[model samples]
Target: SLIVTRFAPSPTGYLHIGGLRTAIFNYLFARANQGKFFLRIEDTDLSRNSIEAANAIIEAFKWVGLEYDGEILYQSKRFEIYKEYIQKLLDEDKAYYCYMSKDELDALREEPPKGIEPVVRIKVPQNEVIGFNDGVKGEVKVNTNELDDFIIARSDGTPTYNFVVIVDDALMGITDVIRGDDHLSNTPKQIVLYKALNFKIPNFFHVPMILNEEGQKLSKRHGATNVMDYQEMGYLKEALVNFLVRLGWSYQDKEIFSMQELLECFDPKDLNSSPSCFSWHKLNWLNAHYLKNQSAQKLLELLKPFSFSDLSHLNPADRLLDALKERSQTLKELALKIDEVLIAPVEYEEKVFKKLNQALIMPLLEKFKLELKEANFMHKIIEEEKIKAGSFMQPLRLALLGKGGGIGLKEALFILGKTESVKRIENFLK
Candidate 1:
């Protein structure tokens, strides 16, 4: 059978990091198999759904480059289809309506006087084991007797999630069901529906949950849970995808994989059985690695939105990127670092200024300013001066860049050019 996969997200809010990983896994698996990966918006919960939220999901997918095949499937628009399926089950006596109220259900939980208020429930088989071989987690079995007659439709006549999900997946001919393990308990219920409806059962892969560094479930408190939050914070899409891929799957000990390599190497069976911890430190490290190695031109293009620096003055923007990329892990950082080239420092580091003052390096700076003017502030002349001045180079760095860290004084001076270099040094000398 041809493989088919999907990423179905509810339009409740921003796409969480965990949901992005699930989508990525589905996308990779489908691409690897030369099959189709499609997107679905599960916006059936009308009370919590918003158009803004749905648009955000689409935006996140586009940002991460997880393109879906064909048009997006919106569950809200298919209410009639879901209702048709529910009616089919009702006519076949596979499901039935119960006149049970919440208070009555609560009473049933306390004792056993099961009365109702017209909620539709699927008729589960008694005392049978519903089992399936999961692609990642291996064999999983749930006892049918342990389950009650679960609601298929609410008392208000709207189809519930489990019922609508089964109808859509079956109709769409989805061959694989890949999602987070939090939904593992729902699988048996879905499987029962599939069997009752005589729809072909799809392969299942329940990936493990992502936890925070403290081993708690990832949430708002754990830095960023939303995928776009990473983008807003200046993480590259490639780096985000790379880090997300490693959360529950691996290709040996490899730390990085390009998009092509990821599609080629990823497999559902390789997913880790245990939960993966989301380490902010590890993600920043990956971002830095990607930033350092990316082509200078590419870095500049990605950095453009984050920077307001006048690139017209900074000839060959790639050269500036090449100089600054190593010093930055995020585009925001790269943008800030670029100021050393295009903009003069507004304030000098106090400790650095104090050190320069104590060393009485104004005389050396004055001499270097003259050399800069004479030599047209070339890198070779700056290097020669550094060699001659020795210890005075440190104070020059403080005067030029306002800090003790960054590219070498020669490269910094070369980028700053003759005019800015001379002016900064002269100001510091005074």
Candidate 2:
């Protein structure tokens, strides 16, 4: 049951949605089996890749609580080993260097095309079927007749993308390669390289994509595609991990799972072979669940990073958070509620306030202002004035919060307390 998985990301920028999912599943699988999980940066393309991008990847893993094993392996550091392997393939006639600029049919696409120099390509065997057992989708087979003599090293003296990928995974003894479904087409080509180099083929599992409800591509135009965006939006890491894990995999009909529960119950066999739709509403639902279940003291501590309006003036902050938590879907949202409930409104909603008909609600405000000073006695005043509940509190809500009817008047007054409550009514009267 010794399992090993690696999350190799090309550090061209911040980590995106697909890479985050694979890294999470790989971490889960490895930990569940008491195996090792590795973090690898495919930084061979020095022109586009950056150290900050590499640093951001590890930062994301840390934020997600994924404790990867050992040190990170950079492809650039192991260039000499790949060079030696290419020489071994050349010695055995499995590979050859061609000095031609004409065709450039099978040249790699990550960089500028170089046609005037030598390029290395592994020899392809014709009419043979290359097959392997997919970890998630059963068996996969591809015919060599459909293959090309793809270049391993280009004329620019740089190794192609998948070529160095195999060099890293093979040398690191990565037993399983967990990546996105889009990479499935490159598997056959990488398989040929594995055989030419005589390395044991690793297990493959390509997770389905996270598309929209109508099967549209996920992009920045729709919203943030990076993990950093989610983190900065005040979502709990536990909620995000749980939300993503449920997208394409299941533990029976269950919806919520703890890290401990997942470690005991997770298996790759349950991973769905089809793509899943992303529901932003579902993420907000999960975040709200976590927030409501969290201790008020903990949420108070979590709000330290946020700038709350008149936070210093809020009385009994813990109790207010308990009430606020039930209404907010995120910490950022909860902070806004805190500002609305705790801080006095600067201006009333003019549209709502305009309808106040001061001649009518003015008498109700004067009666409540006098009674509120008597403290926490609202219903008796509503009856004593022979007024309807909304008739009295609708304008009261505007005076306290800019809008009407959100967060109960009783709860709002309880949080705002008598002093601030009387002051807001006095301000509204003036």
Candidate 3:
């Protein structure tokens, strides 16, 4: 049997970090087994679903390289199928309709005595136990009494959420189900439905929920929780995957793993039941690790959207790429750092500016201007001409970057080009 997995995302909002993590796990597992990975658009909630949201889901997954093997499946397209399953369950007496109104259900919850009519629910066999081995949580068993007859369909015949999902997952031939731990309570019902319908129950793996800095589940009010937001903020795709994988499972003491390494090393049984706390600081560290690992050319491609051309006098794009290799964690940080390095005559903090020029620097800056104009060199070769970048650059930088130290003076001058470098020096002299 081919190992099969699915990344089922609701088309209701941007594909957030939580969803990305789930997709990563499924992708890793499927690849490890040389099986198929499929994408399912859970767009049953038509009231909230948008085409923009669905596009974002597909695009974000593509951006992260979580390519699926099969045709993209949408739940909305299978309404007739779910309707058929609902009627099948009803006809087989496995499920029944509850005529209870919302007020009545509320009243029952408020005041329930034995013999009150139960709301429509699946008829679990009396005095029996349902057991399934969770890939992560180990064996999980729930007694039949702990479950009520869950509504397969509303009194008006609208299929319930759990029912539709079972139909879709079975039809799609998803051999394994991997999702957040929030669904643990619903697993037993799904298992019962699967057995009743004669569909083979897939293996289960529940990743822990990602929490915020305050130890709460990640949410919009806390900050940007979406995946594209992180990409826009300059995080590498691999870094996000690495960080997310370790959230509930780990490879001993390892902190980083390539995608191939992850597949070779991941053991579903190794996952723990503990909740992983989401830390911005740890993510920043991971981003920095990826920064150090990327080549300058690759970093350049990643940084293109931030508009590098607008800030520099000469195209220090090459230099900018090198600088970001070790210097950036988020794209915002790269932009700010590069903006400072590339732009000339940056506004200095008044106190620092006044301190540098007290009595010794004015004449030196004047002389530096003449030397810079006369050096006359190309961007790459200028650095090798035996002129130290900092000796002239320190004072030059005081005038340009608004700081004493930067990507160094010669490279800075080379990047600043002959024209802007001279202009900035001239400004310092006056």
TM-score of each: 0.90, 0.89, 0.86
Cα lDDT of model 1 overall?
0.81
Candidate number that wins on TM-score, 2 or 3 = 2
Per-residue lDDT of 1-430 in model 3, one digit per residue for the tens? 4788888764447788888888878888888888899888876555544666888888888888888996898766777887787778779888775667667766885564455454347777767899988887788898986776677766455666787778778887889988788778989988888998999899998877977777888878887888888888888888888888888877789887888898788767777778888877888898888877777556556667874545423344376556555766776688767777666654665756665644656776765566556767543223334556644445656777777556765566666667776777677667
Scored by lDDT, model 3 comes in at 0.74
> What TM-score number comes out for model 2?
0.89
lDDT of 1 by residue, 102-177 (tens): 6787689568335444778899989899999998888998889778788989977888788778888988889998
Candidate order by TM-score, decreasing, is 1, 2, 3
- Cand. 2 Cα-lDDT: 0.80
Sort by lDDT, best first: what order? 1, 2, 3
Tens digit of per-residue lDDT, candidate 2, span 49-80: 47778888878878888888999888778878
Candidate 1 residue pairs that clash: 98-118, 99-116, 99-117, 99-118, 100-116, 100-117
In candidate 2, stretches whose alpha carbon ends up further than 4 angstroms from where it belongs are 46-49, 102-115, 313-317, 360-367, 374-383
Cα displacement (Å) at residue 102, model 2: 6.7
**Cα miss at 407, model 3 (Å)?**
3.4
Error of 3 at 274 (Å): 2.7
